[PDB]
Design a binder for this molecule. Structure first.
Ligand SMILES: CCCCCCCC(=O)N[C@@H](CCCCN)C(=O)O
Ligand SMILES: CCCCCCCC(=O)N[C@@H](CCCCN)C(=O)O
Lengths: 250, 250
């Protein structure tokens, strides 16, 4: 293995390090995804495509991979600068574009795995998954539950997130999180912290974006890197409606 | 709360955000601690002292908070640059020196909590904890278990790591990790992945440094930030001999 991956030994053999080096990852969303990209790059995944159309905002600094100097810059330009300072020989391809129903299929082509970190206020979070399923591309959905990291993998031949959507209202991250907490309580392991923050968020007078913490960003980035390593080396993983939830109490 | 910590709301109230802002943290060791430092800084902990005498090497980039440009610079110089580019008004005090029996007490004095990330090949890992107990400074011990993050907190009036050290034989991180695996198995939760890497590492022909992965580093950084927040806000915590273990498998 290379001197950069020296301490990866025993956990990974030389042939696995080689395999994940060129494994093409598609990253939709450079918010929580900017933390995921660094952890995955340092692990050894050197072929990452990042698509995001937002700019770096002040409020990102509590949980995303940007600096004071990055504010007002395209997230994709900023995270590529960061990633290429970690690994100059890395293959980091960025696109400062929003995903739409018209362009999303062309971006997906050519990748072996995808990470759906798209805001539900755009238009294509679920269509993205539908297209990936058609192409044998498993999809990681990472969520920042503040204290917890949540990941579920949409597998090509399995259920989609549609199963938790009601046909009359739009579907966002609050539906996934309400699904997860309800699942946990039903099966005898309630996450009262998660139920508490769901309750607090719903009863807010003003309508704001969900809160997120650096802890959940860092934990979910670790989970994704492990899941990516498992998919690339064809080790077993749980697919939706199953999920991975990781927190200080677990 | 500044607009930088805007998305921290509900999880933290404004009075909690202010408290951790000036909460003096001592971080001994800027390796795994460099990942911990960023996650805690973005969370709102703005008063961090970092002590480490090593320089940045190539093998650090697979799991530590450094870049190719940082290589050959004092780890403490690199991590202060990284952190201060995230938050210019942060109070980041560094010391480019190894801790010894003579200097370790004066570094500890003045902090409310400490993170002992000191290599067990130095002379002061256990003495570091003893002084903190004498001063009512709880000590977090974070460990990188590859796929897992492990944190144990030494509380001032509780058991120290001495309890698992053997009178007469040398004590290193493998003793801590072997206690955790044995403890988990004792309780019917064997971590066979963890037991596997211990076996592989012990039966290594050559004597090398333990492997570590970016996955555990990112996970343990999140755990430490949650634990730090709980200690500052006087929320209950688990003390050694109990510990926190977090992995995808759990
Ligand atoms: C009230 C507590 C619930 C918190 C909601 C989760 C918010 C979140 O994790 N949002 C990601 C987008 C990923 C979505 C993938 N379908 C981001 O803002 O990057
Ligand atoms: C064979 C598997 C066992 C792995 C050993 C754990 C190594 C580790 O986590 N070492 C930290 C130092 C923190 C120590 C705190 N008392 C570092 O190298 O930063």
């Amino acid at each position: 293995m290379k001197h950069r991956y020296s301490r990866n030994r025993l956990y990974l053999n030389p042939k696995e390090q080689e395999l994940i080096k060129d494994y093409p990852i598609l990253l939709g969303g450079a918010g929580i995804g900017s933390i995921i990209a660094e952890c995955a790059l340092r692990f050894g995944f050197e072929n990452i495509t990042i698509v995001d159309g937002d700019h770096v905002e002040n409020s990102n600094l509590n949980r995303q991979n940007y600096t004071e100097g990055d504010v007002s810059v395209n997230k994709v330009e900023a995270i590529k600068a960061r990633l290429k300072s970690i690994n100059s020989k890395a293959n980091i391809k960025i696109h400062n574009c929003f995903l739409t129903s018209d362009n999303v299929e062309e971006y997906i082509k050519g990748h072996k795995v995808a990470i759906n970190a798209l805001d539900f206020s755009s238009e294509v979070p679920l269509l993205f998954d539908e297209i990936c399923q058609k192409m044998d591309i498993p999809v990681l959905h990472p969520y920042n539950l503040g204290w917890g990291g949540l990941v579920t993998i949409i597998s090509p031949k399995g259920l989609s997130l549609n199963s938790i959507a009601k046909k009359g209202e739009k579907f966002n991250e609050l539906n996934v999180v309400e699904y997860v907490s309800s699942y946990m309580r039903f099966w005898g392991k309630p996450q009262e912290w998660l139920e508490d923050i769901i309750y607090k968020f719903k009863n807010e007078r003003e309508k704001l974006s969900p809160p997120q913490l650096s802890v959940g960003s860092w934990v979910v980035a670790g989970m994704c890197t492990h899941i990516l390593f498992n998919i690339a080396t064809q080790r077993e993983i749980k697919s939706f409606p199953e999920f991975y939830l990781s927190s200080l109490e677990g």
